[PDB]
């Protein structure tokens, strides 16, 4: 009798590289370099697309950011034409403030409990339209209650009851004209001082015309602080002051009671697709150890290499005939 | 391969063997047949899966790093940031290239090795009852029906049973 020993072969072999040979055919191989993205920055993740919403706007509530005031997110996507503000102004320490928010997890809001006696608090503007002229959702605009009436020296203290450090934002208003300040807040010296156990500073309006944006020569500037638990922020002002109505609490400081921990905030021009590794080209699978898509990455990512392909043999040498 | 079985004294692979990587083909009084060897097949597959387990699904988390694209000329510090990243990529590109070349050489050698082990094991089983024809085939010097062939494949072949018949056939004129 005859007994022959042998091995299999396939008609469709794959060429791989070895130590001694540039081109050798094996029965099967797998690709080690990820070379494509689906074109979207992300399935299985909780994501929010701010869209028109600027990110900082989530804190103080322009009409844009109406949906996203109390958002809960694992992944947060900023967008390019987004405007943080309805009435022209800018945040102090702006870039630093966003980085806080991106990694927040989202934000929870609770009222600071402020109440007012003799003032207009319902200040509205052409800039925040919203069915009818309006203001920031999360703040109150304070006015004399009778035009040209000198504004009251007032004091507010709010104390951070919660375990998570609170986020507090306030405004200084620089009026369109020296007149408008007068009409709004009365006349004479205007001083605003903000006091916390780690924080104190004093602000004064410097009223003037500035280039007309959103139809307003006037500006509002936002200053923010982080308040440790059990700490009082004291607000003292004779006017020109935009007041926080609500405190912002991060979700990744929650006690596992709202708690949605640790988000990654990205900047993307791509659509979304719910069908771990992010590149500027879009998210990429991370099953492969290497990738050729982008040297810039975030997350659990394959390592960037220059090769476009690297085949790992997963079968024996292919010897047909 | 370094053992010289696959692409060596075994002239070619069998496309018609689709139930295993290694196996037996026989010809006897009852006909011609083919049967896969599961143990050697699984031994090769386990080693390859061991390699895959080291490479697949084990990436490492990175978060905040350095910038790697720049919109303005800055000189010194930007030269340094670019050089650091370029250095890192070349070193990882080297690691990846060598890893694949080394693993592949080894995969081709281990699969050749499993084939050789099966051949050597079979040879020892047959004792003085068969001769190696030099192409991975044994000439068996006795009547060996399907059950006999089967006993060889499953390691229950008793050479003493056939030895007298085999020796007379081998050593004559």
């Amino acid at each position: 009798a005859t007994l022959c020993l042998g091995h299999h072969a396939v008609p469709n072999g794959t060429i791989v590289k070895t130590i001694t040979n540039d081109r050798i055919e094996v029965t099967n191989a797998t690709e080690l370099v990820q070379n494509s993205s689906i074109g979207e920055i992300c399935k299985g993740k909780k994501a929010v697309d701010l869209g028109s919403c600027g990110i900082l706007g989530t804190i103080i509530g322009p009409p844009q950011c109406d949906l996203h005031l109390e958002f809960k997110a694992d992944l947060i996507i900023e967008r390019r034409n987004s405007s943080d503000i309805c009435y022209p102004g800018r945040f102090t320490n702006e870039e630093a403030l966003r980085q806080i928010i991106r990694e927040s997890g989202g934000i929870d809001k609770e009222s600071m409990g402020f109440r007012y006696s003799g003032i207009r608090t319902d200040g509205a503007t052409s800039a925040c339209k919203r069915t009818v002229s309006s203001f920031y959702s999360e703040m109150k605009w304070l006015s004399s209650s009778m035009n040209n009436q000198v504004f009251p020296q007032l004091n507010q203290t709010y104390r951070n009851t919660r375990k998570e450090p609170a986020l507090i934002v306030w405004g200084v208003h620089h009026s369109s004209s020296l007149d408008e300040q007068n009409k709004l807040y009365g006349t004479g010296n205007k001083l605003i001082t903000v006091g916390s156990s780690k924080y104190q500073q004093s602000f004064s309006p410097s009223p003037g015309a500035r280039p007309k944006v959103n139809g307003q020569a006037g500006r509002i500037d936002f200053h923010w602080m982080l308040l440790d638990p059990g700490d009082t922020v004291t607000f003292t002002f004779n006017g020109a002051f935009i007041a926080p109505d609500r405190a912002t609490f991060l979700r990744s400081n929650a006690p596992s009671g709202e708690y949605n921990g640790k988000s990654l905030g990205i900047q993307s021009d791509a659509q979304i697709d719910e069908s771990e590794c992010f590149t500027p080209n879009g998210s990429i699978p991370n099953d492969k150890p290497f990738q050729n898509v982008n040297r810039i990455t975030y997350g659990a990512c394959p390592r960037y290499v220059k090769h476009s392909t690297l085949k790992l043999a997963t079968g024996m040498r292919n010897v047909p005939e | 391969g370094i053992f010289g079985a696959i692409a060596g004294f075994i002239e070619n692979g069998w496309e018609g063997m689709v139930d295993g990587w290694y196996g037996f083909r026989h010809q006897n009084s009852e006909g011609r047949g083919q049967a896969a060897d599961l143990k050697s097949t699984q031994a090769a597959i386990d080693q390859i899966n061991g390699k895959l387990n080291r490479l697949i699904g084990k990436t490492n988390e990175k978060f905040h790093q350095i910038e790697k694209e720049f919109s303005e000329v800055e000189g010194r510090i930007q030269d340094l940031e670019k050089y650091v990243e370029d250095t890192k990529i070349d070193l990882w590109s080297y690691n990846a290239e060598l890893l694949v070349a080394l693993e592949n050489q080894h995969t081709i050698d281990l699969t050749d090795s499993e084939m050789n082990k099966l051949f050597e094991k079979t040879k020892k089983q047959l004792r003085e009852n068969a001769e190696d024809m030099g192409n991975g085939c044994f000439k068996i010097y006795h009547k060996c029906d399907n059950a006999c062939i089967g006993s060889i494949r499953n390691g229950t072949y008793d050479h003493n049973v056939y030895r007298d018949e085999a020796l007379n056939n081998r050593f004559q004129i």
Partner: antibody, heavy 131, light 107 residues
Framework: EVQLLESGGGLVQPGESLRVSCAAS????????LSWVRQAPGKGLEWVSA????????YYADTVKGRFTISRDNSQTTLYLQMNSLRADDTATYYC????????????????????????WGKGTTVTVSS | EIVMTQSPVTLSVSPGETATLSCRAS??????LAWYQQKPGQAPRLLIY???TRATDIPARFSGSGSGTEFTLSISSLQSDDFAVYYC?????????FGQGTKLEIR
């Protein structure tokens, strides 16, 4: 539908033998692996053994390394488990569980991929070992 | 031959809150790790395999993570029917082992 049904079990004296069947019905072509997992009421899960292709497993836990033996009958599509030399602590609800592996592993369809996770569990058969 | 320890033995979480579980494992393990949801009087059901890859047609509120030794399982939006016990297995030592089990409460 990939459900399997466990038959057999019951009350046995310590030291006796008992085999439990597992009718593998449905999507399973039975070129994939299968496993047994036992759990006693009042205790957690514990993997017992596994089977692959033909005789590729040979995979038993250290508790039953010398007692339990796993059979496979692909012609009638039923998985077995001969539990010999049963002791008192062998009283458990033996579950027959499907086995799935990532598609990168399991090169040859029949043989064992040494990384399996159980996806479809069975109804379970309770086996009590006392005097 | 490779013990698995879950923490804690039982946890109380209000419905809606996120419940994070622990699956500490002696010796390294990354490739294979499966989570299960065994409701009382029922067989275990696969939730996540590998480490983070969840099973087919299971809710997205079940999240998985971990590497080598420390592994976590977080249930985003909790429901009253999630009162099951959760387990975690590992590779390989040619001998898979299960976890002790984590009881989840919902007043």
């Amino acid at each position: 539908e990939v459900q399997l049904l466990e038959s057999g079990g019951g009350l046995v004296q310590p030291g006796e033998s008992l085999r439990v069947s597992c009718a593998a019905s449905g999507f399973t072509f039975r070129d994939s692996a299968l496993s047994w997992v036992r759990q006693a009421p009042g205790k957690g899960l514990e993997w017992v053994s596994a089977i692959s292709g033909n005789g590729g497993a040979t995979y038993y836990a250290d508790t039953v390394k010398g007692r339990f033996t796993i059979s496979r009958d692909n012609s009638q599509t039923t998985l077995y488990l001969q539990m010999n030399s049963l002791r008192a602590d062998d009283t458990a609800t033996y579950y027959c569980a499907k086995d799935e592996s990532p598609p990168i592993y399991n090169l040859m369809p029949g043989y064992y991929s040494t990384y399996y996770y159980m996806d479809v569990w069975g109804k379970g058969t309770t086996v009590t070992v006392s005097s | 031959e490779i013990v698995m320890t879950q923490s804690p033995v039982t946890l109380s979480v209000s419905p809606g809150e996120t419940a994070t579980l622990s699956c500490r494992a002696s010796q390294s393990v990354r490739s294979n790790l499966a989570w299960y949801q065994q409701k009382p009087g029922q067989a275990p059901r696969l939730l996540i395999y590998g480490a983070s890859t969840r099973a087919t047609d299971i809710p997205a509120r079940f999240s998985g993570s971990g590497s080598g030794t420390e592994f976590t399982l977080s249930i985003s939006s909790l429901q009253s029917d999630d009162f099951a016990v959760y387990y975690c297995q590992q590779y390989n030592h040619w001998l898979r082992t299960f976890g002790q089990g984590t009881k989840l409460e919902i007043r």
